[PDB]
Amino acid sequence: ADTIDLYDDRGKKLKGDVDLQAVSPLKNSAILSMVNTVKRTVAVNLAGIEKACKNASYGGQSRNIPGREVDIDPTAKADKIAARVKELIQVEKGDDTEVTVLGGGKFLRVAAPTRRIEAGAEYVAGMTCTAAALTEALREEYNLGLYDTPYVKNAVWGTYPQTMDMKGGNVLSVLSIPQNDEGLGFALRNIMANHLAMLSQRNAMNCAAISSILEHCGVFEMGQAIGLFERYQLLALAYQGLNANNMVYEMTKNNGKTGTIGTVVQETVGRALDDGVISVDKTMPSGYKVYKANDVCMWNAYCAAGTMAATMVNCGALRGAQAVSSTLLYFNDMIEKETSLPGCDWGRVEGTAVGFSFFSHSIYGGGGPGVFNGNHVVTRHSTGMAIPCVAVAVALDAGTQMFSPESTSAIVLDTFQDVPIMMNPLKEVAAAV
Amino acid sequence: AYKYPSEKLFVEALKSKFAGLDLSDQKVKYVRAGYLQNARKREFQAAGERVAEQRGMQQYDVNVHLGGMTLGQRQLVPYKLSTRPDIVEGDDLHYVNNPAMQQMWDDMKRTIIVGMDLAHETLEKRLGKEVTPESIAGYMEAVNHTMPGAAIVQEHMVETHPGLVDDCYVKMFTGDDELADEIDSQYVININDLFDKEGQNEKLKAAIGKTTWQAVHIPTIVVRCCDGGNTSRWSAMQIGMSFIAAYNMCAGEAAVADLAFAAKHAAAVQMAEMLPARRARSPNEPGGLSFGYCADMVQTLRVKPEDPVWYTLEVVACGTMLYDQIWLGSYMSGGVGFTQYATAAYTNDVLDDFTYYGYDYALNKYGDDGTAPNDLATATDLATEVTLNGMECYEDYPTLLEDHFGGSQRAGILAAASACTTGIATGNSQVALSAWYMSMYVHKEGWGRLGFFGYDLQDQCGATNVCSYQGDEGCCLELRGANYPNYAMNVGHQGEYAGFTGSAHAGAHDAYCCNPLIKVCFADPSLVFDFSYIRKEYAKGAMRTFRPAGERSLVIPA
Amino acid sequence: AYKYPSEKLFVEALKSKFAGLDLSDQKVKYVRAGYLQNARKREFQAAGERVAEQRGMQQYDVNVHLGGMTLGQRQLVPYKLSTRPDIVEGDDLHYVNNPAMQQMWDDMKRTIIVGMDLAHETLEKRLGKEVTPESIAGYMEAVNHTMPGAAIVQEHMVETHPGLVDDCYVKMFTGDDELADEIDSQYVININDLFDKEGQNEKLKAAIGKTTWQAVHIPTIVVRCCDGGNTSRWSAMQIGMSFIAAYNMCAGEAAVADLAFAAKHAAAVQMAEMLPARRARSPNEPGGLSFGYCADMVQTLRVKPEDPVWYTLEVVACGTMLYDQIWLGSYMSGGVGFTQYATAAYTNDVLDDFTYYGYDYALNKYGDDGTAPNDLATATDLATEVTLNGMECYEDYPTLLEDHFGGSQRAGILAAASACTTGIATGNSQVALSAWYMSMYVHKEGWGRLGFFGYDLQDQCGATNVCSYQGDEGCCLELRGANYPNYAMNVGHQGEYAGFTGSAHAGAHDAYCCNPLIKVCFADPSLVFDFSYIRKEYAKGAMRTFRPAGERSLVIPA
Amino acid sequence: AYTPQYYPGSSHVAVNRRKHMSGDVEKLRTVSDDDLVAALGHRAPGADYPSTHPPLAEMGEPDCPVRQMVEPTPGAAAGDRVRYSQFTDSMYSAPSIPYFRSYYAAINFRGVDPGTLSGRQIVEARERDMEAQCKAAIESEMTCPALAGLRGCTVHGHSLRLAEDGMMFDMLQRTHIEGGNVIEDKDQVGVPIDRKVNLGKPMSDAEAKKRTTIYRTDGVKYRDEEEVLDHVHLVHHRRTMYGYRPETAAETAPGVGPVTYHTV
Numbered sequence A: 001a002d003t004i005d006l007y008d009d010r011g012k013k014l015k016g017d018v019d020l021q022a023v024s025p026l027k028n029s030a031i032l033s034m035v036n037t038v039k040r041t042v043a044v045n046l047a048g049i050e051k052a053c054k055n056a057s058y059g060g061q062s063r064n065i066p067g068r069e070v071d072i073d074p075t076a077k078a079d080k081i082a083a084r085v086k087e088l089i090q091v092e093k094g095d096d097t098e099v100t101v102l103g104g105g106k107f108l109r110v111a112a113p114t115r116r117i118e119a120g121a122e123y124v125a126g127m128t129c130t131a132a133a134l135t136e137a138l139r140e141e142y143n144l145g146l147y148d149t150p151y152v153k154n155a156v157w158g159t160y161p162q163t164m165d166m167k168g169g170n171v172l173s174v175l176s177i178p179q180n181d182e183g184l185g186f187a188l189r190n191i192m193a194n195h196l197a198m199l200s201q202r203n204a205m206n207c208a209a210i211s212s213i214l215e216h217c218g219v220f221e222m223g224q225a226i227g228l229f230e231r232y233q234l235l236a237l238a239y240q241g242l243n244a245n246n247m248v249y250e251m252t253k254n255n256g257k258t259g260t261i262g263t264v265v266q267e268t269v270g271r272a273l274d275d276g277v278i279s280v281d282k283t284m285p286s287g288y289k290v291y292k293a294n295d296v297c298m299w300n301a302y303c304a305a306g307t308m309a310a311t312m313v314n315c316g317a318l319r320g321a322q323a324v325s326s327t328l329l330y331f332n333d334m335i336e337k338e339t340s341l342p343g344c345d346w347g348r349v350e351g352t353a354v355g356f357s358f359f360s361h362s363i364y365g366g367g368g369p370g371v372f373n374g375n376h377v378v379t380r381h382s383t384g385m386a387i388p389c390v391a392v393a394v395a396l397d398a399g400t401q402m403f404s405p406e407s408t409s410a411i412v413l414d415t416f417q418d419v420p421i422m423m424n425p426l427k428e429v430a431a432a433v
Numbered sequence B, C: 001a002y003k004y005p006s007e008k009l010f011v012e013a014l015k016s017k018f019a020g021l022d023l024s025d026q027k028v029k030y031v032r033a034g035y036l037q038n039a040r041k042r043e044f045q046a047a048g049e050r051v052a053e054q055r056g057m058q059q060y061d062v063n064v065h066l067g068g069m070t071l072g073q074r075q076l077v078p079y080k081l082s083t084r085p086d087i088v089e090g091d092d093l094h095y096v097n098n099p100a101m102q103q104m105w106d107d108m109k110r111t112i113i114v115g116m117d118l119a120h121e122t123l124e125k126r127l128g129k130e131v132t133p134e135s136i137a138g139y140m141e142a143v144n145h146t147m148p149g150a151a152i153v154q155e156h157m158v159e160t161h162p163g164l165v166d167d168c169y170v171k172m173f174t175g176d177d178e179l180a181d182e183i184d185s186q187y188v189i190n191i192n193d194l195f196d197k198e199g200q201n202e203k204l205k206a207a208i209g210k211t212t213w214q215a216v217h218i219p220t221i222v223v224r225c226c227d228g229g230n231t232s233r234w235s236a237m238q239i240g241m242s243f244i245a246a247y248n249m250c251a252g253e254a255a256v257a258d259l260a261f262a263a264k265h266a267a268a269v270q271m272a273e274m275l276p277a278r279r280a281r282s283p284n285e286p287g288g289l290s291f292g293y294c295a296d297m298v299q300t301l302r303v304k305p306e307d308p309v310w311y312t313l314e315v316v317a318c319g320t321m322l323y324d325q326i327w328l329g330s331y332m333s334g335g336v337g338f339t340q341y342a343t344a345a346y347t348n349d350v351l352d353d354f355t356y357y358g359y360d361y362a363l364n365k366y367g368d369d370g371t372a373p374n375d376l377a378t379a380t381d382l383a384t385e386v387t388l389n390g391m392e393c394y395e396d397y398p399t400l401l402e403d404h405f406g407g408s409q410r411a412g413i414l415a416a417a418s419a420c421t422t423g424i425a426t427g428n429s430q431v432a433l434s435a436w437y438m439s440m441y442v443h444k445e446g447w448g449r450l451g452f453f454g455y456d457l458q459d460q461c462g463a464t465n466v467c468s469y470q471g472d473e474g475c476c477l478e479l480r481g482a483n484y485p486n487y488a489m490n491v492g493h494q495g496e497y498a499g500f501t502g503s504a505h506a507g508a509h510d511a512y513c514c515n516p517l518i519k520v521c522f523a524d525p526s527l528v529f530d531f532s533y534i535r536k537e538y539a540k541g542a543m544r545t546f547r548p549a550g551e552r553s554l555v556i557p558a
Numbered sequence D: 001a002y003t004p005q006y007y008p009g010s011s012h013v014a015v016n017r018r019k020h021m022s023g024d025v026e027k028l029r030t031v032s033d034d035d036l037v038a039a040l041g042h043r044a045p046g047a048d049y050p051s052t053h054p055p056l057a058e059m060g061e062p063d064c065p066v067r068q069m070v071e072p073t074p075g076a077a078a079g080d081r082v083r084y085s086q087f088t089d090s091m092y093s094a095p096s097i098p099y100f101r102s103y104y105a106a107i108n109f110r111g112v113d114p115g116t117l118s119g120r121q122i123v124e125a126r127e128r129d130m131e132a133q134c135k136a137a138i139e140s141e142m143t144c145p146a147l148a149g150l151r152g153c154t155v156h157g158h159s160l161r162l163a164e165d166g167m168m169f170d171m172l173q174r175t176h177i178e179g180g181n182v183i184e185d186k187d188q189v190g191v192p193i194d195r196k197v198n199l200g201k202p203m204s205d206a207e208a209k210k211r212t213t214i215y216r217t218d219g220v221k222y223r224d225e226e227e228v229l230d231h232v233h234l235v236h237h238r239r240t241m242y243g244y245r246p247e248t249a250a251e252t253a254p255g256v257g258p259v260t261y262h263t264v
């Protein structure tokens, strides 16, 4: 079988000779917990609800419904509203329901009970039970009646159900609605990179882990980690996302002062050759050496680790997210030229990076790296080996972006910054083994 | 204030249809003339003969009607556009035959509103550019060259024929009077000049604030070839090109992607969002159009807000045609379609009579516009009186009943009159919605009939969902639209809902219902369709005197 | 069989563009004339002057191009339609300016194929009706009166002007010759007459079986007002009306709903299915169009199956225009758009030269059409030789490189030549797909460039996804389309994929690629656009000699 | 100890490719800082570097082990704006070809965002870092000032016939010849500048062909560069095989057929 050594975010060894299956999404209790956490946890913007009601700006986007203001102050009653929400959504005493006031009353962290997920088919019960509980709590707290409660309901739920989503509403998730899935099994792929950077508190090693875990959880749900492809995906998860054998950490550290995309390429090849993952195959008349992969899935995993380390060294040096698109492209383009072996995901990282570069530097769509995700038409094409790098680049940015994590995902930071699986994902995954 | 007169508003149209007829007669002689009585049917039959001969295949033929009868065993009657002298044949109000109707929809579908503040913040933050009135002026020139489909950066570009895209343009608007006055007026929607009644301009400027917005209208020919999903994308493409030229940016650098995300999403205000899979549609299609937005597109409110009924019924005319004839009668079905399900709401001054009667009743019982109690008791009183009165009109005037020959038409008009009266009286759209369903229920028990087989799905779900706050039931009327679940299927409601959404804000003497950006955008007289007098435009289209955009005569042979 | 000549196929167009020029010269004198060199740009400038005067607002103005330069600092060159004598200005091939291109797409979008067997089974089972040639004949008359928008059951119906909907019609077709022979031929697509070559008619009839289908084409004007989602609904409504009349049903009983479900869903064959939210679109839009269906709409294969290259390149012309110019260049973006990204594939006989060269190489090395080994080694040989030859052509003829001035154009044409050669040689679409990506990889290393910033997203994903069998990666090429994930964004690929899908079935001397129902439906000469000679139709549109449907001259002023 | 080999091929063009990749490119000219800054058009010569965010030392950074071991470039430490240089290169044997400009940047420079297209190649980086990378490229044998030029917009010309005097077509004519030297008197987006940047003499035709990385029929014919064609084939084949199944057995799967190579 395959074994890996597990290392934490500071390159300290956690556990040795861990069975690769023990970090599988299907087996590792910490990964299972992380999935459950992002499914059932939502944030409530009580300040946004208060503002929408007081200014009758239901639905957002400069909407104003003259005369239909409702003068309520939920941020001043946040503890009372939080207690009612908890009572309304909790299934059993002592269950895993949590409702916590944050920001002095401006926001609510709502971990809906896992039973409400279990009792449904999808993941939206957290969003919907919270929106409903909050609507009821506001109605009761402010003695609302027949003809004003509908407006307050739109302050919570946005333009739902005229729209399929809670557009302009004030119940937030790091997931999107299921109807936005591009295909089968894509819900865990639909996590905005800005969100991922905030989940990790801009710790780039933890961001790699959180993003890689959730991406490969998606790939398993898509049915693209079956049989031989399970080993293929699990090695990529372990080496790119879980700092297996400390390879990502060490390659980044040894190239952090003077290194470049190209020096990380060279280090990856040298490590593959030294470790026996690749060998010289034939030599051309010029002296150029064609390599061969002795372990094909492992060669991919080394390329995945190198792609990530290259992202950390190049975006780290720039302190800018935008270079991630070219890093992913040219790390893999040049490792192929260096070896005559295919690069990460056999060209699918390079290809993702070509279009991602285009749609982060052109008029046609996309945006800065922070708006992409594994469900985005531009960045969906690798099975999990591109987006973790994008999230890391977003975390490393020191302030070059228009739509930064702080502007789109501030509430995500506050909601999850005390959640152990997000504070130390690598230690949690190792401890679960 | 308004005083309801002695002669019913619908009598003129009856006398113009039936010169010399005693309007109390319940009986009539049938001559069973068939189609030859009607000039339009005769013209259609001859058109069908040409069609069949030119293509070698049978097409239109009145004699294919079943039963060995052609249309017109009874008298085929024409339609008067309400408040207009124009009387037209019914076929002239079919949307396929009526270019004013087609262009009203094209004008909405090809519109997107796009903020400029985020783009300007990008230029400052990422490039360190200074945004001045002079740089904005250069941008506005660039965008009005490029948006119709012309080139500004590359070499050896091929372009759209300017004459085919002559309706495409971009104007800016802002609550900041100092900036608005610094830009050449051809590029600016002048809020102060267009909204000079009842201080509406100051309400709009306060609600928009010192923010800058672009009203973008892409070419009609494009949305005709393509769909409403084209609009926000096309707009964003040429916005991006214009920023590249106007600020000397790299023609494709990371910051351009930020401009694209702003123009396409972060600062984009669509007229309508997408729809679910069973009725899958791109954005900017009628199913996604909210009633608040539909009411804000209609501009009679800025012309004569002192008569809230007139604006209300112009919104009814706008919405009933769009939602019933084009959306439900074509997008969601097709064929002969649903012309008269909608014409009942904007012809022969019937709804006008019923609604002005209600307005007068409410003015004398409850007081002035917008001051009646916002409660179920008040909705009950107004809806019941307005509905009874209208039913008595249909009962006392046999040719009025004959005009609204389908129960669904009568249901929609009686309920609209009821809900518009309530909205004007209370100033509250949600209370008016209670009155709408009240009318339906009263009507049903009076005559032991209401509408077509599936007319009152939403009406029997109706009263209980007015004041629900549950996830897929609760919603303020302004934000409801043609995808609100109960409303997603059936004729004879959606445009009326838009109408009395307008009626509530007209009764409150507001400047708009739901979005001030929509309101300013559609006031602009540079649009092809005149959104300030819907029924007059429909008359033009029916009389073949409305010139639409998007024709291809410049590039086709004779 | 075919012999590749000694004069390159593209030389004629070069000589017609540059009278007297030494085609080997690498340098040229630039005179920097600007737009006044070009009649079409001068016409556009004058058109923009009228637009601006008429509406009070600046529009097109060549002088707004950045840098103080107008288009035409180099020579602006025209385009020869491949295999045609017609040379046109490039703007004449912009889809907005070209009614033939618009009508080709409208003819696709307004088409739905609907089975009749389920409906006949319903009438038998639920009503005990007998379905005969005589009852079917009565139905076909009914449906050709009703489908354009005319009434058959109710009284006082208003109808579409038959001249506005003259392009709308329904024909039936069937593998059962006995039935096809009993129906008036004006109502029948004659499979035996249209598919007389190489036994194609017997292949189609065997694939369809003794089943009966309707080819429904709703009015162009309707899909222009609305969208492609209108098509199956409009069809079903009038199919339903026609069954009610032709079988004396209750006009609205439970059995009618069974006919509706059959017409809308259970027996309905859409041209294209819906798309995900990011690019939400109704059915019957280009993103949902599979390459197999696109190839099967083109009819050159029934005209001259003995020259597989001609049909292949007509498919390329159909697909590149639709997918790049209309779909990606408008629905998914807009503006000036993507005319020349597509014209590279259907003008100046360039792709023709590269592809006939490959065809001759394959014939001499591997043998006749369709007999080459279906393997990666064969894809490698053909793609490398065809790509190297084409690159050498661009290197040896500087004005050829100048024609395909964008690398994206060169990449698509070199790879299309490679994959079309491989498809014709091997008769296998999937092997041809390996050849397509091989060409890209060879090209990139030769010149150190390929296409635009984002051109080879799909191509770097490409080779590894040809033979994947994973959920969202694996797929045979015939069933891939413009929503296959890697393909969902970028120019220079989709229409070429359709082309060499066709090439593989042309090489195999099949009668169709993917669906025989589509093949028969679009062979019908009653369509407005001639699907049997795409590039000839494009030339007519570019020369303003193509008459499209859907115009409104009958109901507008002048 | 791993020795990079960069790229296959034995022709002098492949040797030039490895030179660009490895950074072993000869300096052929000098461009002063003030001249380069004027050409780039992002700030006045002599002006302070504008900022997009405060210096890192002033605002501090999140607690991140990667930030703590990856050294910021000087421009990142300073908070510079991300700016760019963009070059277009003639297909008539310009020394540079777009992808190898991007490999040069990606191998030899830190914190860079290179982009490759057919008619333009861009390097985005923090402004002062961008300037250093552009100076290195523009002063080196990677650049001929007739066959290549700074073009931040309106890039048309890489695939066009050269002007009679050897200059690549530029719709904005940002450069022109004066007495045998290429002069630049507009910035890279076409704005006139108040100076004449003298970029020196163009490469002769023979020099361009000795220094070029492009394969074409009038130089090193691509068809004869078998090692490169072998490399392309091998990478395509292995991508194809492993997409089917990522294992050695896929390399002889049914459908591969008798794959063969020229030099191995």
Ligand code: F43
Binding pocket: B334, B335, B336, B337, B338, B339, B340, B341, B342, B405, B406, B407, B408, B409, B451, B452, B453, C146, C150, C151, C152, C153, C154, C155, C157, C158, C237, C238, C241, C244, C251, C252
């Ligand atoms: C076949 C149906 C069942 C169905 O699914 N739709 C039908 C027919 C359909 C067809 C009729 C076209 C034709 O005549 O060929 C169209 C035009 C839709 C289309 N396919 O284009 C239509 N009805 Ni219907 N349908 C209407 C109506 C109605 C009224 C008419 C009652 C009366 O006393 O005349 C009744 C329902 C009711 O009783 O409430 C009705 C029923 C019916 N409606 C019965 C036919 C009734 C009959 O046998 O005569 N429609 C109306 O109530 C007014 C608007 C009118 C629509 C056309 C327009 O809006 O101009 C038309 C809307």
Ligand code: F43
Binding pocket: A361, A362, A363, A364, B146, B150, B151, B152, B153, B154, B155, B157, B158, B237, B238, B241, B244, B251, B252, C334, C335, C336, C337, C338, C339, C340, C341, C342, C405, C406, C407, C408, C409, C451, C452, C453, D117, D118, D119, D120, D152, D153, D154, D155, D156, D157, D158, D159
């Ligand atoms: C601003 C961008 C970045 C972006 O997102 N899109 C642009 C511009 C956009 C605009 C240009 C319209 C105008 O001039 O105002 C349009 C027409 C799309 C639109 N908005 O309608 C377009 N490109 Ni572009 N674009 C093209 C192309 C190209 C080629 C041109 C290279 C050359 O040597 O001339 C290069 C990419 C490359 O190098 O591979 C290119 C880049 C670019 N393209 C650079 C501008 C380059 C410049 O500064 O000159 N396009 C082409 O390669 C051919 C097709 C051509 C398209 C028009 C048509 O198909 O007819 C047009 C397609």
Ligand SMILES: C[C@@H](OP(=O)(O)O)[C@H](NC(=O)CCCCCCS)C(=O)O
Binding pocket: A359, A364, A365, A366, A367, A377, A378, B233, B264, C278, C279, C328, C329, C332, C333, C454, C488, C489, C490, C491
């Ligand atoms: C990426 C995506 O854009 P967003 O990132 O969602 O704004 C998508 N556009 C496209 O794919 C544009 C493709 C056509 C223009 C570029 C052709 S290469 C769309 O609008 O749905």
Ligand SMILES: O=S(=O)(O)CCS
Binding pocket: B452, B453, B454, C252
């Ligand atoms: O008769 S039904 O009510 O089914 C249809 C009315 S158009």
Ligand SMILES: O=S(=O)(O)CCS
Binding pocket: A358, A361, A362, A363, B252, C452, C453, C454, D117
């Ligand atoms: O320059 S880009 O490749 O972004 C667009 C080409 S149309």
Ligand SMILES: [Cl-]
Binding pocket: A226, A227, A228, A229
């Ligand atoms: Cl397996």
Ligand SMILES: [Cl-]
Binding pocket: C028, C029, C030, C031, D163, D164, D165
């Ligand atoms: Cl010259």
Ligand SMILES: [Cl-]
Binding pocket: A294, A295, A296, A297, D246, D247, D248, D249
């Ligand atoms: Cl292996």
Ligand SMILES: [K+]
Binding pocket: B223, B224, B225, B226, B227, C223, C224, C225, C226, C227
């Ligand atoms: K349309």
Ligand SMILES: [Kr]
Binding pocket: A041, A042, A043, A172, A173, A174, A411, A412, A415
């Ligand atoms: Kr959240």
Ligand SMILES: [Kr]
Binding pocket: B091, B092, B097, C161, C555
């Ligand atoms: Kr008409």
Ligand SMILES: [Kr]
Binding pocket: B156, B157, B158, C076, C077, C090, C091
């Ligand atoms: Kr042109």
Ligand SMILES: [Kr]
Binding pocket: B114, B115, B116, B118, B119, B239, B259, B262, B263, B267
């Ligand atoms: Kr914008």
Ligand SMILES: [Kr]
Binding pocket: B108, B109, B271, B272, B284, B285, B286, B288, B289
């Ligand atoms: Kr809309």
Ligand SMILES: [Kr]
Binding pocket: B359, B362, B363, B367, B368, B369, B370, B424, B425
């Ligand atoms: Kr009133």
Ligand SMILES: [Kr]
Binding pocket: B444, B445, B448, B449
């Ligand atoms: Kr009743």
